[PDB]
Design a protein around this ligand. Structure first.
Ligand SMILES: [Cu+2]
Ligand code: NA
Length: 639
């Protein structure tokens, strides 16, 4: 199921307006309180007008609206079930403006919701852009509008959340399609659950920021239920999805052809393992005792070229196990892995013990000591996040998480780890004074500017329960060694939520739930707009534009020349991310050293070490002096 974020508004006083209504299926049937009556557009004898169909409400008075519920027709007929939709709010009934929510609802008869941030409005409009089976009609049994108890306007300078993207599924795994810029999400065998899966099928969905279209598709070709997997963008730009509900499979998503392809079977059955692209475009994986068995799952490496999985038995999982109360089932999951120099992989936690994984020979592991600082040794941080905000200086920021996967309190620990040469004990220090808010199951992304956006989670980890939520996000400014709160959101984002950086510099935050029947499913995502895109007056700043690229495919050590429309102060390369279960081994940022060629022409070299400039797709962003970034340019980096 799902739930609204506010309380239902009384329908005494409403005045409803519909585009069409068939006698018997009147406009008001949707607001009578009886699940048996339903509004229906013209049909048969009145003809068959196609969508968009519109349902407008006049509340008479101004409310702190925060949501809507759309219960479809419950008579077993599917006719009129809304697919594509849009929700608008008006204070006057004439000036609607931009939708507070839009997206697609799944083709079923469960109550559909639109949860969005609180906005005072007297009028509400729901536009049915599409019927779910491609029919001309729209039908609604009952319709409700929710309200917040109070209204507090976002503070200036702290970002803004909104709009809400409505999805057919709970996006528990996601990825950016590099060549298309679309956000790819998957659930499992069902749109809202994974439990007792027959395996072999995965429900996927995509959102296109350019066209605003949300679409879904069942993937059966790789005969893999992609829930709870390893995710890596390999050397060739393919997304490698391993195990999970089908513990030994490998599925490959090719962005170019926008197709799914079957890969070789892993050597070892795994679930909840982390996987990391290596300096040579290969994929390394270790642990994953959630699926395929609970035992010691040592390393394995995938070669895109030969299309084989090879076991690395001396790349031992043992030194990286946390001290989880549930033992091995949890202890080897979601390792904080980073591909580094010379086929090496660094493991930064969650265990207190950090390690060096080597991929030469039948593998190896070497200790890197302990995450610690002046305040002591850092405890296990299962579900803490790890972000490489400066791959050049080998900087990794670590935060939050808990000793045990669940039923454990989260912490505010935060650390800066600096990597050197593989085999060496990196330097770790505490980050400022820690997070403002203790959290676990939170997500994060490194922004164009090297700052890390931190959002969601709860203070005590209890999967599928939206208890002790943190709605106030935080941004860590590396240069200042300071954390800063941002405007809070209204949707709880705890277990199974995700975050990805969008090519326009905005953050896509969504998901949480995937517990079937529970009311904690969240079939959506919100957009967070960082203050870097707003000018002094709360308006959107003007963006520098990248008018030309010498090329869009470059070798490590290679050079790129660009022309801009305006003078730019800084530049950065951000590798395209993949996310699920708090793990994102794909994102990393490389700060660029720009050569001014005069005339708004600049050149830069892409780092020569492929362990720094890991092969795959990257977004190129340029910032003016004001700090406003351009929309990314996509650059393919080859080793
Ligand atoms: Cu899970
Ligand atoms: Na009704």
């Amino acid at each position: 199921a799902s739930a609204p974020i506010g309380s239902a508004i009384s329908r005494n006083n409403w005045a409803v307006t519909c585009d069409s209504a068939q006698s018997g299926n009147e406009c008001n049937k949707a607001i009578d309180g009886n699940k048996d009556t339903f509004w229906h557009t013209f049909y048969g004898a009145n003809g068959d007008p196609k969508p968009p169909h519109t349902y407008t409400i006049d509340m008479k008075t101004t409310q702190n609206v925060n949501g809507l519920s759309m219960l479809p027709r419950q008579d077993g007929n599917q006719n009129g079930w809304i697919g594509r939709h849009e929700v608008y709010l008006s204070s006057d009934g004439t000036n609607w403006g931009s939708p507070v929510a839009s997206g697609s609802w799944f083709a079923d008869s469960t109550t559909k919701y639109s949860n969005f941030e609180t906005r005072p409005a007297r009028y509400v409009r729901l536009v049915a852009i599409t019927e779910a089976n491609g029919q001309p009609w729209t039908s609604i049994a009952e319709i409700n509008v929710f309200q917040a108890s109070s209204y507090t306007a976002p503070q200036p300078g702290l970002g803004r959340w909104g709009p809400t993207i409505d999805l057919p599924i709970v996006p528990a795994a996601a990825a950016i399609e590099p060549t298309s810029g679309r956000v790819l999400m998957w659930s499992s065998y069902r749109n809202d659950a994974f439990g007792g899966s027959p395996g072999g099928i995965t429900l996927t969905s995509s959102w296109d920021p350019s066209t605003g279209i949300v679409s879904d598709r069942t993937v059966t070709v790789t005969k893999h239920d992609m829930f709870c997997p390893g995710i890596s963008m390999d050397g060739n730009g393919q997304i490698v999805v391993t195990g999970g509900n089908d513990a030994k499979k490998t599925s490959l998503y090719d962005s170019s052809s926008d197709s799914w392809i079957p890969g070789p079977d892993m050597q070892v059955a795994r679930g909840y393992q982390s996987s990391a692209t290596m300096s040579d475009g290969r994929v390394f994986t270790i642990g994953g005792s959630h699926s395929g068995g609970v035992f010691e799952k040592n390393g394995e490496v995938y070669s895109p070229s030969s299309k084989t999985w090879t076991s690395l038995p001396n790349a031992k999982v043992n030194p990286m196990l946390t001290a989880d109360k549930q033992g091995l089932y949890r202890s080897d999951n979601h390792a904080w892995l980073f591909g580094w120099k010379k086929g090496s992989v660094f493991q930064a936690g969650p265990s207190t013990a950090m390690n060096w994984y080597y991929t030469s020979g039948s593998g190896d592991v070497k200790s890197a000591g302990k995450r610690q600082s002046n305040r002591g040794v850092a405890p296990d941080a299962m579900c803490g996040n790890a972000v490489m905000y400066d791959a050049v200086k080998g900087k990794i920021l670590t935060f939050g998480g808990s000793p045990d996967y669940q039923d454990s309190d989260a912490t505010t620990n935060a650390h800066i780890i600096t990597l050197g040469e593989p085999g060496t004990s990196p330097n770790t220090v505490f980050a400022s004074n820690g997070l403002y808010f203790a959290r676990t199951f939170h997500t994060s992304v490194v922004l164009p500017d090297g700052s890390t956006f931190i959002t969601g989670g709860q203070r005590r980890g209890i999967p599928f329960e939206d208890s002790t939520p943190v709605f106030t996000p935080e941004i860590y400014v590396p240069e200042q060694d300071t954390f800063y709160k941002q405007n809070p959101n209204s949707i709880v984002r705890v277990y199974h939520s995700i975050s990805l950086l969008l090519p326009d510099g905005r953050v896509f935050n969504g998901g949480g739930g995937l517990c079937g029947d529970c009311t904690t499913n969240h079939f959506d995502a919100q957009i967070f707009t960082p203050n870097y895109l707003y000018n002094s007056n709360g308006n959107l700043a003007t963006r520098p534009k990248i008018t030309r690229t010498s090329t869009q495919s470059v070798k490590v050590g290679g050079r790129i020349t660009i022309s801009t429309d305006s003078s730019i102060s800084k530049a950065s390369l951000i590798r395209y991310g993949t996310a699920t279960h708090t793990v994102n081994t794909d994102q990393r940022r490389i700060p660029l050293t720009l050569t001014n060629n005069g005339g708004n022409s600049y050149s830069f070299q892409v780092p020569s070490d492929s362990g720094v400039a890991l092969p795959g797709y990257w977004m190129l962003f340029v910032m003016n002096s004001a700090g406003v970034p351009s929309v990314a340019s996509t650059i393919r980096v080859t080793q």
